[PDB]
Short mmCIF file of C-alpha atoms and ligand atoms in Angstrom, two decimals:
data_model
loop_
_atom_site.label_atom_id
_atom_site.label_comp_id
_atom_site.label_asym_id
_atom_site.label_seq_id
_atom_site.Cartn_x
_atom_site.Cartn_y
_atom_site.Cartn_z
CA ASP A 8 9.43 -29.95 3.65
CA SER A 9 6.37 -32.19 4.42
CA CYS A 10 3.93 -29.25 5.15
CA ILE A 11 0.17 -29.16 4.33
CA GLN A 12 -1.25 -25.87 3.01
CA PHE A 13 -4.57 -24.08 3.65
CA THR A 14 -5.63 -22.84 0.18
CA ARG A 15 -7.75 -19.85 1.43
CA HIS A 16 -5.28 -18.62 4.11
CA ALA A 17 -3.65 -15.77 2.12
CA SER A 18 -7.09 -14.47 0.93
CA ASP A 19 -8.52 -14.66 4.51
CA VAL A 20 -5.48 -12.72 5.87
CA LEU A 21 -5.97 -10.00 3.24
CA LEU A 22 -9.76 -9.84 3.94
CA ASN A 23 -8.97 -9.27 7.65
CA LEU A 24 -6.30 -6.65 6.83
CA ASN A 25 -8.94 -4.80 4.77
CA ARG A 26 -11.47 -5.05 7.69
CA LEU A 27 -8.82 -3.54 10.02
CA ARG A 28 -8.21 -0.72 7.48
CA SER A 29 -11.99 0.03 7.20
CA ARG A 30 -12.23 0.31 11.04
CA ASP A 31 -8.98 2.33 11.24
CA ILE A 32 -7.39 -0.35 13.46
CA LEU A 33 -3.57 -0.16 13.91
CA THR A 34 -3.20 2.01 10.79
CA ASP A 35 0.20 3.76 11.16
CA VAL A 36 0.45 6.17 8.22
CA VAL A 37 -1.64 8.69 6.31
CA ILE A 38 -0.92 9.05 2.55
CA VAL A 39 -1.70 12.61 1.40
CA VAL A 40 -2.70 12.98 -2.27
CA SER A 41 -3.32 16.69 -2.87
CA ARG A 42 -6.53 17.52 -0.92
CA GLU A 43 -7.20 13.87 0.06
CA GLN A 44 -5.93 11.66 2.90
CA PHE A 45 -5.82 7.86 3.04
CA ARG A 46 -5.05 5.90 6.23
CA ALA A 47 -3.23 2.58 5.79
CA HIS A 48 -0.84 0.02 7.26
CA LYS A 49 2.85 0.58 6.23
CA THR A 50 3.46 -3.18 5.91
CA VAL A 51 0.62 -3.68 3.39
CA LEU A 52 1.78 -0.68 1.31
CA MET A 53 5.39 -2.04 1.25
CA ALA A 54 4.10 -5.55 0.37
CA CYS A 55 2.23 -4.13 -2.73
CA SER A 56 4.36 -1.21 -4.00
CA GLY A 57 8.03 -0.80 -4.95
CA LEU A 58 7.76 2.91 -4.05
CA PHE A 59 6.39 2.25 -0.52
CA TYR A 60 8.89 -0.63 -0.04
CA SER A 61 11.71 1.90 -0.78
CA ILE A 62 10.15 4.66 1.45
CA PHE A 63 9.50 2.58 4.56
CA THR A 64 12.86 0.71 4.44
CA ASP A 65 14.57 4.17 4.58
CA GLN A 66 16.09 4.75 8.08
CA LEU A 67 14.44 8.26 8.37
CA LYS A 68 11.20 7.83 6.38
CA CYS A 69 10.26 4.54 8.16
CA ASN A 70 9.33 6.71 11.23
CA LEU A 71 7.10 9.23 9.42
CA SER A 72 3.33 9.14 10.11
CA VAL A 73 2.49 11.29 7.03
CA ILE A 74 3.73 10.74 3.42
CA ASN A 75 2.95 13.33 0.76
CA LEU A 76 2.69 12.03 -2.81
CA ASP A 77 3.72 13.96 -5.96
CA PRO A 78 1.06 16.65 -6.79
CA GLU A 79 0.55 15.10 -10.28
CA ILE A 80 -0.95 11.95 -8.61
CA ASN A 81 -4.72 11.66 -8.99
CA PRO A 82 -6.55 10.88 -5.65
CA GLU A 83 -9.16 8.63 -7.38
CA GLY A 84 -6.32 6.71 -9.10
CA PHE A 85 -4.61 6.32 -5.71
CA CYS A 86 -7.92 5.22 -4.04
CA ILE A 87 -8.51 2.50 -6.73
CA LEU A 88 -4.93 1.22 -6.23
CA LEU A 89 -5.13 1.31 -2.40
CA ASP A 90 -8.39 -0.76 -2.69
CA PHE A 91 -6.56 -3.19 -5.02
CA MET A 92 -3.70 -3.57 -2.50
CA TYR A 93 -6.17 -4.63 0.24
CA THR A 94 -8.53 -6.76 -1.92
CA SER A 95 -6.79 -8.06 -5.18
CA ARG A 96 -9.70 -6.32 -7.03
CA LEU A 97 -8.96 -3.50 -9.52
CA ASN A 98 -11.82 -1.18 -10.51
CA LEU A 99 -10.47 -0.49 -14.03
CA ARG A 100 -12.77 1.65 -16.24
CA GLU A 101 -12.43 3.65 -19.49
CA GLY A 102 -12.85 6.85 -17.41
CA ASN A 103 -10.05 6.06 -14.96
CA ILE A 104 -7.54 3.81 -16.85
CA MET A 105 -5.06 6.62 -17.71
CA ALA A 106 -4.99 7.85 -14.04
CA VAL A 107 -4.73 4.26 -12.70
CA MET A 108 -1.81 3.42 -15.03
CA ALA A 109 0.11 6.66 -14.21
CA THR A 110 -0.43 6.07 -10.46
CA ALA A 111 0.63 2.35 -10.76
CA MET A 112 3.82 3.44 -12.64
CA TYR A 113 4.66 5.96 -9.85
CA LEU A 114 3.84 3.41 -7.09
CA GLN A 115 5.87 0.72 -8.95
CA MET A 116 3.03 -1.87 -9.17
CA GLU A 117 4.19 -3.82 -12.30
CA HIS A 118 1.20 -6.21 -12.66
CA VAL A 119 -1.29 -3.27 -12.61
CA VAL A 120 0.83 -1.36 -15.20
CA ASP A 121 0.80 -4.56 -17.35
CA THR A 122 -3.03 -5.01 -17.37
CA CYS A 123 -3.51 -1.22 -18.06
CA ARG A 124 -1.13 -1.37 -21.07
CA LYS A 125 -3.03 -4.45 -22.41
CA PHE A 126 -6.50 -2.86 -21.93
CA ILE A 127 -5.25 0.36 -23.66
CA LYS A 128 -3.70 -1.58 -26.60
CA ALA A 129 -7.05 -3.46 -27.13
CA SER A 130 -8.95 -0.10 -27.47
CA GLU A 131 -6.58 1.37 -30.15
CA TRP B 18 -6.07 -28.30 3.11
CA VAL B 19 -3.84 -29.63 0.29
CA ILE B 20 -0.38 -31.10 -0.37
CA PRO B 21 1.36 -27.99 -1.85
CA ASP C 30 -18.90 -4.17 -9.28
CA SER C 31 -17.07 -4.59 -12.66
CA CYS C 32 -13.55 -5.21 -11.10
CA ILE C 33 -10.84 -7.55 -12.50
CA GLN C 34 -8.85 -9.61 -9.96
CA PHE C 35 -5.15 -10.58 -9.81
CA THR C 36 -5.22 -14.26 -8.73
CA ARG C 37 -1.73 -14.29 -7.07
CA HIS C 38 -2.08 -10.93 -5.24
CA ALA C 39 -3.00 -12.26 -1.76
CA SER C 40 -0.19 -14.90 -1.88
CA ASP C 41 2.38 -12.26 -3.06
CA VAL C 42 1.32 -9.90 -0.20
CA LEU C 43 1.77 -12.71 2.35
CA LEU C 44 5.18 -13.70 0.84
CA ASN C 45 6.34 -10.06 1.26
CA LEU C 46 4.95 -9.88 4.83
CA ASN C 47 7.00 -13.00 5.63
CA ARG C 48 10.15 -11.42 4.02
CA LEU C 49 9.63 -8.32 6.22
CA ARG C 50 9.28 -10.59 9.31
CA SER C 51 12.52 -12.50 8.43
CA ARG C 52 14.43 -9.17 8.15
CA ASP C 53 12.75 -7.77 11.31
CA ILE C 54 11.26 -4.87 9.30
CA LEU C 55 8.46 -2.87 11.01
CA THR C 56 7.79 -5.71 13.48
CA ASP C 57 5.95 -4.07 16.43
CA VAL C 58 5.54 -6.82 19.04
CA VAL C 59 7.49 -9.62 20.66
CA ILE C 60 5.50 -12.74 21.72
CA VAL C 61 7.16 -14.40 24.73
CA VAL C 62 6.59 -18.17 25.07
CA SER C 63 8.41 -19.27 28.22
CA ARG C 64 12.16 -18.94 27.41
CA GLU C 65 11.56 -18.04 23.73
CA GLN C 66 10.78 -14.76 21.95
CA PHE C 67 9.14 -14.28 18.54
CA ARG C 68 9.02 -10.92 16.74
CA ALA C 69 5.97 -10.27 14.55
CA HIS C 70 3.56 -7.72 13.07
CA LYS C 71 0.41 -7.13 15.23
CA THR C 72 -1.81 -6.85 12.13
CA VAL C 73 -0.79 -10.29 10.78
CA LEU C 74 -1.31 -11.92 14.21
CA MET C 75 -4.82 -10.33 14.49
CA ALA C 76 -5.63 -11.39 10.88
CA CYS C 77 -4.82 -15.09 11.75
CA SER C 78 -5.83 -15.57 15.41
CA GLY C 79 -9.00 -14.91 17.42
CA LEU C 80 -6.84 -14.51 20.54
CA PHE C 81 -4.54 -11.85 18.98
CA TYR C 82 -7.57 -10.13 17.37
CA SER C 83 -9.07 -9.80 20.91
CA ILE C 84 -5.72 -8.68 22.50
CA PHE C 85 -4.78 -5.98 19.99
CA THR C 86 -8.33 -4.51 19.72
CA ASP C 87 -8.18 -3.94 23.53
CA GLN C 88 -7.70 -0.19 24.29
CA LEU C 89 -4.76 -0.91 26.74
CA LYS C 90 -3.16 -4.05 25.23
CA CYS C 91 -3.06 -2.57 21.67
CA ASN C 92 -0.12 -0.38 22.88
CA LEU C 93 1.99 -3.16 24.43
CA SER C 94 5.27 -4.13 22.70
CA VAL C 95 5.57 -7.44 24.65
CA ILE C 96 2.83 -10.13 25.08
CA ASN C 97 3.46 -13.07 27.40
CA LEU C 98 1.63 -16.29 26.52
CA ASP C 99 0.31 -18.85 29.05
CA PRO C 100 3.24 -20.95 30.46
CA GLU C 101 1.54 -24.18 29.24
CA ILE C 102 2.10 -23.06 25.59
CA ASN C 103 4.86 -24.97 23.81
CA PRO C 104 7.39 -22.67 21.96
CA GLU C 105 7.81 -25.16 19.04
CA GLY C 106 4.00 -25.35 18.69
CA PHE C 107 3.87 -21.53 18.66
CA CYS C 108 6.76 -21.34 16.10
CA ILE C 109 4.96 -23.79 13.70
CA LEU C 110 1.75 -21.72 13.98
CA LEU C 111 3.54 -18.36 13.55
CA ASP C 112 5.16 -19.83 10.36
CA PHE C 113 1.69 -20.96 9.19
CA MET C 114 0.28 -17.45 9.75
CA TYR C 115 2.96 -15.93 7.45
CA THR C 116 3.06 -18.71 4.80
CA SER C 117 -0.25 -20.80 4.72
CA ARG C 118 2.06 -23.85 5.29
CA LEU C 119 1.62 -26.02 8.43
CA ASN C 120 4.48 -28.31 9.44
CA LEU C 121 2.23 -30.97 11.02
CA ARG C 122 4.06 -34.11 12.25
CA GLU C 123 3.29 -37.06 14.56
CA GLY C 124 5.84 -35.63 17.04
CA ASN C 125 4.28 -32.16 17.21
CA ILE C 126 0.52 -32.62 16.44
CA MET C 127 -0.64 -32.58 20.11
CA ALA C 128 1.35 -29.33 20.83
CA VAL C 129 0.18 -27.72 17.55
CA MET C 130 -3.50 -28.52 18.28
CA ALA C 131 -3.32 -27.23 21.90
CA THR C 132 -1.58 -24.03 20.72
CA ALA C 133 -4.13 -23.55 17.84
CA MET C 134 -7.02 -23.97 20.36
CA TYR C 135 -5.46 -21.31 22.66
CA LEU C 136 -4.73 -18.96 19.71
CA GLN C 137 -8.28 -19.56 18.34
CA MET C 138 -7.19 -20.75 14.85
CA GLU C 139 -10.25 -22.92 13.93
CA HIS C 140 -9.01 -24.31 10.57
CA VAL C 141 -5.74 -25.56 12.18
CA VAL C 142 -7.72 -27.16 15.08
CA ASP C 143 -9.95 -28.85 12.43
CA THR C 144 -7.06 -30.45 10.42
CA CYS C 145 -5.36 -31.58 13.72
CA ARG C 146 -8.58 -33.28 14.92
CA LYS C 147 -8.92 -35.04 11.51
CA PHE C 148 -5.25 -36.21 11.44
CA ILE C 149 -5.62 -37.51 15.06
CA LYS C 150 -8.91 -39.35 14.29
CA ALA C 151 -7.24 -41.08 11.27
CA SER C 152 -4.43 -42.48 13.54
CA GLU C 153 -6.82 -44.00 16.16
CA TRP D 21 -5.96 -11.37 -14.18
CA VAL D 22 -9.50 -12.86 -14.13
CA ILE D 23 -13.18 -11.86 -13.94
CA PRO D 24 -13.87 -12.71 -10.24
N1 LIG E 18 7.40 -5.45 1.58
C1 LIG E 18 8.06 -5.85 0.73
C2 LIG E 18 8.94 -6.36 -0.28
C3 LIG E 18 9.98 -7.24 0.00
CL1 LIG E 18 10.33 -7.59 1.64
N2 LIG E 18 10.73 -7.84 -0.90
C4 LIG E 18 10.41 -7.55 -2.16
N3 LIG E 18 9.46 -6.73 -2.60
C5 LIG E 18 8.71 -6.11 -1.65
N4 LIG E 18 7.69 -5.32 -2.06
C6 LIG E 18 7.58 -4.75 -3.31
C7 LIG E 18 8.72 -4.35 -4.03
C8 LIG E 18 8.64 -4.08 -5.38
C9 LIG E 18 7.42 -4.23 -6.02
C10 LIG E 18 6.29 -4.67 -5.33
C11 LIG E 18 6.37 -4.95 -3.97
C12 LIG E 18 5.18 -4.85 -6.32
C13 LIG E 18 5.81 -4.41 -7.62
O1 LIG E 18 5.27 -4.36 -8.72
N5 LIG E 18 7.10 -4.06 -7.36
N1 LIG E 19 -7.75 -8.90 12.21
C1 LIG E 19 -8.80 -9.36 12.23
C2 LIG E 19 -10.14 -9.85 12.25
C3 LIG E 19 -11.23 -9.09 11.86
CL1 LIG E 19 -10.98 -7.44 11.49
N2 LIG E 19 -12.47 -9.54 11.73
C4 LIG E 19 -12.61 -10.83 12.00
N3 LIG E 19 -11.68 -11.70 12.39
C5 LIG E 19 -10.43 -11.21 12.53
N4 LIG E 19 -9.44 -12.07 12.87
C6 LIG E 19 -9.63 -13.30 13.48
C7 LIG E 19 -10.67 -13.49 14.40
C8 LIG E 19 -11.06 -14.77 14.76
C9 LIG E 19 -10.40 -15.85 14.19
C10 LIG E 19 -9.40 -15.67 13.25
C11 LIG E 19 -9.02 -14.39 12.87
C12 LIG E 19 -9.00 -17.02 12.73
C13 LIG E 19 -9.85 -17.96 13.54
O1 LIG E 19 -9.86 -19.18 13.49
N5 LIG E 19 -10.63 -17.21 14.36
CL1 LIG E 20 5.40 12.74 10.30
CL1 LIG E 21 0.71 -5.08 -8.81
CL1 LIG E 22 5.21 -3.38 26.79
CL1 LIG E 23 -6.53 -21.14 10.94
#
């Protein structure tokens, strides 16, 4: 086509989606990770995670308002990844890298798994 | 705005 | 903070949101523009438009599944803008620029109004 | 990935 493109559009959309999340506006699911709960938008989760894409395209699970993750999943690891989904920013640290990588593998977030593997290989 |  | 950032993340999220829209997955509103209907996600509309942000933060309107736009709004103009919201790409042409600008003004999409004004000024 |  002969379209023009607004460079910052995708980033501005994501910034607004994060603002809606912070104010709990039109959030439609709560992700339970052991003792912790995280409110989010199903569409953003599906757009970032192979696991959530699978869950919310399921004819029964698409209607659930609560999703319980595997008890081995670390809440801090999940929190860091949920923040990444809504911001493009990953708070990767020596103290959390193993939990972040294991959570990214479970959530099926290939690019996060890739940078974790690379940061781990550099430290060995 | 740009030509993509 | 000491975060790392994935450059393509915002664009990949938007691409997936558009794929969900095309397959009618978790769309939660229909926008009626005279004889035409457009299914979309409320969060994306709010993230792109001052008008939709106002509508869906309203305590009564947030729960509506159908929103009827002003009868002066052109459906093709709306379609071009809805595509822009989900892709960052604006199909701006001599034959549609007046309708696109009027629709962008109504929807409160400042950056679109700005490029329309500039393209119009160049042709006079 | 970049340093933002
Ligand atoms: N929502 C949506 C969606 C759609 Cl519509 N099409 C294709 N992928 C979608 N999302 C999704 C699927 C697999 C993975 C990711 C996202 C990130 C990753 O590492 N794996
Ligand atoms: N959703 C959301 C939202 C939030 Cl949370 N905060 C601030 N703006 C939001 N969206 C929104 C408001 C005004 C305008 C636009 C988008 C584009 C434009 O030209 N005007
Ligand atoms: Cl439930
Ligand atoms: Cl990823
Ligand atoms: Cl309704
Ligand atoms: Cl805009």
